[PDB]
């Protein structure tokens, strides 16, 4: 229990108020309440901006000074941004406070403490009562019940067998394990047969309260806590929505759990193709892919569904946002798909914070709107561990019921089919606390912190880019707008010169406009897509604004190796693109480190420093070629390779043509089960059907799915696989990833169906 | 670091050895080695039998006394039962030890310390070196690498977003959560992109070492660590083994994950029917269900598979052991199924310790044998959290390759289809430590402890039963043999009079013999099934040895309520049967508590104590009937109800006839998805097809599966559902469980397919 | 919380049982359980006949001596004359206690603690659980509810006007009165 006392000057002689506050602090310390005494609102504000728990605020000001009134109001607002219901007492002389009494006072003051004419014991008692009341309401339901039940230690005569961790403390290695992870983790592993807590699978007890609380917070009709991640969430939604006799509309930018759902249901998929830019970044699906005309055309043109043109699709999935931070206008996406569909799924695995900041308004699924009765059913999956604060495997399904909805009894069968009968309640508790951290003021506060951090990085990097440009030198630039426009005053700004409050407030400063050249998605409509500020992509020099390589450049593979040397592992990478993630776990000013690292690269790139010094782990790959060589030399070699072979056009040709579909993904997987499959070298893939999916990095989205044909000798897909293999052979240590291929003798094998 | 010094009398004047040991202990304490000095081998043995970590043993004995030689050998053997590689130094006079030098000395002594003629600093240095060597090899691979990597604190620029728990410490509730679960849990939640550790899904790094270590320990060819539990394990094995065009042989005693696998694969099931006894305990499948003749008959008689008689089954599943502790002779089961099958699955979810004690020899899947080349493929799933020491959701798949095996590339597709892309590494580390605790001597030691504990409970309860019988009074008896026979000496014993070493050593003391009356599985072959000692069932009085109720009795529902009042929640329960579980988390002598509780019941049952005092939570259900009433009165009412309605014959008729099968489980689930289903009252189930499974408790195994018909007006299955509903209405607070039914207005609804 | 450990001679060499009981007493003192160790049933009986609250009895005897069996039975009966539901654990070697197992043992023994072959931490946990169970059932209903509600200190807006004794502490004579009779008397005047 900690109380913060912020008082400046309450008496004309500071002795009186100082001694009164001292007596109060002494009484509070006697009732076991730590106290922090501060004499200025600036220092009190700085103390509040540290992540210290404050259980009560007692403040007192001049009461005749409007400046200190504003400072105190700002203090209390800052306090309640993240510590929302902390009690606030006014420390004051009686009459100065009673002449200042009004509604504005009572909107922020909870209690009065006439410090100059009252017993400090009485005030301390009232402070302690307020603190206890505050702390009794602080935890979310499931966490509260688990913390209460963790005090129960007796041997139950049922599983789990470790019995609150007692089983581990019987061998020495088990004792090390138990001491490392601590007692409480094992004391909360209680099993589903305690009525004091409930059960996840029945949705009862504190688990029902948790899911109702999360539905309230995230704006859904129903919510489901999942302990198998968004893989399991997507898998159960697809299992509930579609059957073997259905046709479904799939974002071609889909996670592999989407094709797992297609295999487990057997439905016949139709694909919406996303767009690319010159950097190989996958962008949004355009509206001309989503119109009812386009969907009926796609269905009628599919060798598997051309006998289903009279049939309504049972499911559609759209990934929002994309891996590269592109957010759809979900209102418009829903309005387009409402012309063909009753169920729309938004795989918002990276996009769970979006509801809790006005910058993302209209660009997410569960919106604060007036809801029509003729709306389709909306599903949204959040991976609570990716960008919210939760342990791995925690996830949420959110359901907003509309047309052709799935009631609870029908949905729970799919829910149970993809779950476990013994869930780990630590994962459920992490979902509960993650939903709690976004509730109220704290969601806005945390998303604001992250967005301001990312905007600082972006503006600083753009500034350095311009500054090296004036020196006629190269540097890394962020992938965002160059010029922003304040809509209120109409004034234009360089991005690095814009006010941070404009960029944090104004959503149009992040929209991809069809007249701007930065995003590179040619022919995109306006007010269709948006850039998520916290997915920060930086662009290495070397690509021209028209789509062809420049005379010189620096490939992102080398910079990625440099970063990996320093422990900085990027999420996404292309030829000239590196994506960094700012999460709510980041601390303030950390991005400076990243800036520093990039600057170091430039120096060691200009001095052509020997690879043996800077990157010994790269020389360890092929010492015959990477020894004896410098950083700028390897960079120039990579860039010459890119000029000669140009894999970017290869990627565009492989991803602008969809492969020929031969069978559904379920039929290809069942060829795997029937042992009718075989590994095939890339040079022999002509006319062969893929038995599993091929996902090359870049672009990181699947090139072929199960049951699709590789094509002719002139097929772009085999050419792109060859390009990746050729890179991997030319530059050891800089090999690409390709999910779905085995790599034997540095050479790719794909498991294809036997003829 | 702790060293145990056990010395008795090394010099003719104890002053010399006492002062030498004191100087040694002082040097060890100077190098930060805690010391425990003991002067007798009995006290040293008692110290070793506490769960204290000992890093080094230094002992010294008379060296001319054979009695102390035996005591010291026993001391070191006891030490190495659970602390297997602890260094042992001999403290001795040089010449007395050199005249005693031989192979037997060196088999237990690791180092010499001539304590009477050497510097204590030298001995302390060698002790510290041995301790460091011992502790460097103590942890299993994955746990070792996670503990090393948990020291790395920097912000990675990738998921999980909480960043080692930093994200939680930003709201006050998050800080409470973080302090409750501790820092290390969140520091090990690192994500799959750290090459220092590896990844679960690729089976690389420390994860490959972990799975190879577990395959070594559990006796498999390959092992797979699973973070979705045995639900996920069963689901992936079934997904890998069978396809929609297959026929499969299913133990009718199957977990609901088995039918989930049937729904996800679409295969056509054929059922092996298990046996019951008079207590409603489900027993083994008899060999006459497993012969190739019986399987071909079952296939030819099935409305779904009668067009597949020319086809070999692709999968069979057997649950071993059963929920009630019945273990099959898995050698004979494998030999029977090898006549029809290439793949056999043992769902050993409750039976993971079986390899590590000779009492279970030949009664589990992964046996130490000479392996033929013509053997079928064997799968075994262990739920590592049920009876081993692991967190919930931890599980193992074990594969022993044989005929028609599934190679790694084909199996990994099914593995990935039912997993998550972001596994929680705490679960994997718990698998690793659970496999470590069973390796070497410690597996035998721990299983011995548990089995001796359960045998003490059994013999004490049988003793009390006989003792109340001599008083011509009733009591609870354990469900095991009444008379055991020592095969060596041929001598017969009452169970409570047999030596504990006989019962722990001799496997025939637990086999169900067809001439004995205790087990009640009439017409069982001999040496086919076995009783697992640690699944301890107690029998309430009231059932006769021929199958009909006695004149008086005590129903187990009332005793179960009594136990639940005291925090003792049984795993299994029937009309007269209550099953308690002894796990490796139990402590020694705990079963006495249980005995005490039962005795209390008897007193309060004989004094007919008012329900208001003893069981107020039962009166809270229906105060109008359960107030004003006593314990023996409610017991007599329940027993009269059982006499009048006799639900045991109802259970036998419902489970001796299989329901008519109309469609595969996948087709019924897809009727659920197509919204072609509806809730139906029990009184209207005639001719209706079940859309999901109905699992009544008792017996706890499914009565109908998806796609099966409830039958005529005279169907035993509707009659048994009515019996359960009638009990539930007659005795509020004592309601049965029935998975698959909704309970609206105290009345059962089953979701059936629409006609 | 106080546990009484009365043991006389459990091993042929008293060192073993003495060190085991010492480790147990240390664990109990670590979980905030005061311990009183006595080596004879006469002194244990004299200790029980003082009005000291005993929350758990852990005893161990020779197990082959009928005289000490009678002394221990007399000890436990004396304990339960005024402290009726105090938990009693038997401290024993496993086999000596299992050969002595019968109804008469279980009529007075509530728990077993195999002191010579078990962790003292496990036994201490079970002792603490038994003590907590015993103390949760000790008070009669009205006294239990008043003691619970006396922790509630807030100003109610109704009589009595002294408001849990706060009214008295406003004059010096009232403060003397309040200190003399103590806070709880006025906190229960609700």
mmCIF file of C-alpha atoms in Angstrom, chain A residues 199-336:
data_model
loop_
_atom_site.group_PDB
_atom_site.id
_atom_site.type_symbol
_atom_site.label_atom_id
_atom_site.label_comp_id
_atom_site.label_asym_id
_atom_site.label_seq_id
_atom_site.Cartn_x
_atom_site.Cartn_y
_atom_site.Cartn_z
ATOM 1 C CA UNK A 199 -14.102 -24.799 -16.173
ATOM 2 C CA UNK A 200 -13.011 -23.319 -19.485
ATOM 3 C CA UNK A 201 -14.818 -25.922 -21.566
ATOM 4 C CA UNK A 202 -18.221 -25.457 -19.920
ATOM 5 C CA UNK A 203 -17.763 -21.657 -19.846
ATOM 6 C CA UNK A 204 -18.810 -21.585 -16.186
ATOM 7 C CA UNK A 205 -17.624 -19.983 -12.979
ATOM 8 C CA UNK A 206 -14.954 -17.331 -13.337
ATOM 9 C CA UNK A 207 -14.445 -18.455 -16.937
ATOM 10 C CA UNK A 208 -17.923 -17.320 -17.925
ATOM 11 C CA UNK A 209 -17.337 -14.016 -16.146
ATOM 12 C CA UNK A 210 -13.984 -13.696 -17.925
ATOM 13 C CA UNK A 211 -15.469 -14.307 -21.363
ATOM 14 C CA UNK A 212 -18.377 -11.931 -20.746
ATOM 15 C CA UNK A 213 -15.928 -9.288 -19.529
ATOM 16 C CA UNK A 214 -13.796 -9.767 -22.640
ATOM 17 C CA UNK A 215 -16.846 -9.550 -24.896
ATOM 18 C CA UNK A 216 -17.675 -6.264 -23.173
ATOM 19 C CA UNK A 217 -14.136 -4.913 -23.576
ATOM 20 C CA UNK A 218 -13.525 -5.990 -27.179
ATOM 21 C CA UNK A 219 -17.026 -5.114 -28.371
ATOM 22 C CA UNK A 220 -18.343 -8.562 -29.297
ATOM 23 C CA UNK A 221 -21.552 -10.453 -28.668
ATOM 24 C CA UNK A 222 -19.687 -13.544 -27.487
ATOM 25 C CA UNK A 223 -16.040 -14.228 -26.738
ATOM 26 C CA UNK A 224 -14.172 -17.503 -26.408
ATOM 27 C CA UNK A 225 -10.834 -17.939 -24.687
ATOM 28 C CA UNK A 226 -8.533 -20.330 -26.551
ATOM 29 C CA UNK A 227 -5.406 -22.088 -25.276
ATOM 30 C CA UNK A 228 -4.257 -23.365 -28.687
ATOM 31 C CA UNK A 229 -3.601 -19.937 -30.174
ATOM 32 C CA UNK A 230 -5.080 -18.318 -33.226
ATOM 33 C CA UNK A 231 -4.230 -21.518 -35.067
ATOM 34 C CA UNK A 232 -6.865 -23.226 -32.945
ATOM 35 C CA UNK A 233 -9.178 -20.210 -33.152
ATOM 36 C CA UNK A 234 -9.106 -20.097 -36.956
ATOM 37 C CA UNK A 235 -9.404 -23.862 -37.059
ATOM 38 C CA UNK A 236 -12.541 -23.941 -34.897
ATOM 39 C CA UNK A 237 -14.194 -21.017 -36.704
ATOM 40 C CA UNK A 238 -13.670 -22.719 -40.047
ATOM 41 C CA UNK A 239 -14.860 -26.024 -38.592
ATOM 42 C CA UNK A 240 -18.066 -24.366 -37.395
ATOM 43 C CA UNK A 241 -18.800 -22.340 -40.530
ATOM 44 C CA UNK A 242 -18.256 -24.617 -43.526
ATOM 45 C CA UNK A 243 -18.778 -28.191 -44.639
ATOM 46 C CA UNK A 244 -17.510 -30.388 -47.455
ATOM 47 C CA UNK A 245 -20.292 -29.186 -49.798
ATOM 48 C CA UNK A 246 -19.503 -25.476 -49.398
ATOM 49 C CA UNK A 247 -17.609 -22.866 -51.376
ATOM 50 C CA UNK A 248 -15.572 -20.321 -49.427
ATOM 51 C CA UNK A 249 -13.790 -17.062 -50.230
ATOM 52 C CA UNK A 250 -10.213 -17.007 -48.948
ATOM 53 C CA UNK A 251 -7.796 -14.110 -48.762
ATOM 54 C CA UNK A 252 -4.780 -15.432 -50.642
ATOM 55 C CA UNK A 253 -2.807 -13.652 -47.902
ATOM 56 C CA UNK A 254 -3.747 -16.359 -45.425
ATOM 57 C CA UNK A 255 -2.040 -17.969 -42.465
ATOM 58 C CA UNK A 256 -1.357 -21.686 -42.785
ATOM 59 C CA UNK A 257 -4.035 -22.362 -40.170
ATOM 60 C CA UNK A 258 -6.540 -21.221 -42.803
ATOM 61 C CA UNK A 259 -5.481 -23.998 -45.146
ATOM 62 C CA UNK A 260 -5.454 -26.368 -42.175
ATOM 63 C CA UNK A 261 -9.102 -25.435 -41.729
ATOM 64 C CA UNK A 262 -9.711 -26.033 -45.432
ATOM 65 C CA UNK A 263 -8.185 -29.503 -45.091
ATOM 66 C CA UNK A 264 -10.193 -30.297 -41.975
ATOM 67 C CA UNK A 265 -13.500 -29.143 -43.472
ATOM 68 C CA UNK A 266 -13.040 -30.142 -47.113
ATOM 69 C CA UNK A 267 -14.594 -26.987 -48.557
ATOM 70 C CA UNK A 268 -13.763 -25.747 -52.045
ATOM 71 C CA UNK A 269 -11.790 -22.474 -51.881
ATOM 72 C CA UNK A 270 -11.893 -19.391 -54.084
ATOM 73 C CA UNK A 271 -9.089 -16.871 -53.682
ATOM 74 C CA UNK A 272 -8.992 -13.089 -53.521
ATOM 75 C CA UNK A 273 -5.594 -11.955 -54.781
ATOM 76 C CA UNK A 274 -3.782 -9.181 -52.865
ATOM 77 C CA UNK A 275 -1.591 -6.506 -54.391
ATOM 78 C CA UNK A 276 2.151 -5.940 -54.259
ATOM 79 C CA UNK A 277 4.374 -2.908 -54.490
ATOM 80 C CA UNK A 278 7.853 -2.577 -55.955
ATOM 81 C CA UNK A 279 9.455 -3.529 -52.632
ATOM 82 C CA UNK A 280 7.754 -6.918 -52.577
ATOM 83 C CA UNK A 281 5.465 -5.837 -49.739
ATOM 84 C CA UNK A 282 2.080 -7.536 -49.903
ATOM 85 C CA UNK A 283 -0.688 -4.979 -49.820
ATOM 86 C CA UNK A 284 -4.455 -4.933 -49.573
ATOM 87 C CA UNK A 285 -7.006 -6.751 -51.645
ATOM 88 C CA UNK A 286 -8.560 -4.198 -53.917
ATOM 89 C CA UNK A 287 -12.332 -3.608 -53.890
ATOM 90 C CA UNK A 288 -12.550 -4.993 -57.432
ATOM 91 C CA UNK A 289 -11.742 -8.437 -55.991
ATOM 92 C CA UNK A 290 -14.611 -8.320 -53.482
ATOM 93 C CA UNK A 291 -17.638 -7.169 -55.472
ATOM 94 C CA UNK A 292 -20.417 -9.744 -55.969
ATOM 95 C CA UNK A 293 -19.579 -9.745 -59.679
ATOM 96 C CA UNK A 294 -15.947 -10.640 -59.004
ATOM 97 C CA UNK A 295 -16.900 -13.399 -56.572
ATOM 98 C CA UNK A 296 -19.424 -14.967 -58.941
ATOM 99 C CA UNK A 297 -16.857 -14.766 -61.739
ATOM 100 C CA UNK A 298 -14.238 -16.467 -59.560
ATOM 101 C CA UNK A 299 -16.675 -19.205 -58.562
ATOM 102 C CA UNK A 300 -17.771 -19.804 -62.150
ATOM 103 C CA UNK A 301 -14.140 -19.956 -63.323
ATOM 104 C CA UNK A 302 -12.957 -22.532 -60.786
ATOM 105 C CA UNK A 303 -12.562 -26.179 -61.896
ATOM 106 C CA UNK A 304 -13.838 -27.261 -58.472
ATOM 107 C CA UNK A 305 -16.789 -24.907 -57.935
ATOM 108 C CA UNK A 306 -18.161 -24.336 -61.448
ATOM 109 C CA UNK A 307 -21.029 -26.632 -60.445
ATOM 110 C CA UNK A 308 -21.861 -24.402 -57.473
ATOM 111 C CA UNK A 309 -22.594 -21.045 -59.144
ATOM 112 C CA UNK A 310 -26.166 -21.209 -57.803
ATOM 113 C CA UNK A 311 -24.786 -21.570 -54.261
ATOM 114 C CA UNK A 312 -24.004 -18.864 -51.722
ATOM 115 C CA UNK A 313 -20.513 -18.959 -50.163
ATOM 116 C CA UNK A 314 -20.543 -20.069 -46.541
ATOM 117 C CA UNK A 315 -17.418 -18.287 -45.311
ATOM 118 C CA UNK A 316 -14.889 -15.635 -46.182
ATOM 119 C CA UNK A 317 -11.623 -14.796 -44.484
ATOM 120 C CA UNK A 318 -9.672 -11.531 -44.691
ATOM 121 C CA UNK A 319 -6.386 -10.911 -42.886
ATOM 122 C CA UNK A 320 -6.446 -7.472 -41.245
ATOM 123 C CA UNK A 321 -3.957 -6.103 -40.767
ATOM 124 C CA UNK A 322 -1.355 -7.626 -43.059
ATOM 125 C CA UNK A 323 2.087 -8.694 -41.858
ATOM 126 C CA UNK A 324 3.544 -5.449 -43.214
ATOM 127 C CA UNK A 325 1.104 -3.256 -41.304
ATOM 128 C CA UNK A 326 -1.538 -2.510 -43.939
ATOM 129 C CA UNK A 327 -4.976 -2.076 -42.385
ATOM 130 C CA UNK A 328 -8.151 -2.369 -44.414
ATOM 131 C CA UNK A 329 -11.092 -0.054 -44.024
ATOM 132 C CA UNK A 330 -13.149 -2.824 -42.460
ATOM 133 C CA UNK A 331 -16.424 -0.899 -42.765
ATOM 134 C CA UNK A 332 -16.050 -0.825 -46.550
ATOM 135 C CA UNK A 333 -14.762 -4.407 -46.697
ATOM 136 C CA UNK A 334 -17.809 -5.552 -44.742
ATOM 137 C CA UNK A 335 -20.107 -3.554 -47.016
ATOM 138 C CA UNK A 336 -18.604 -5.174 -50.114
#
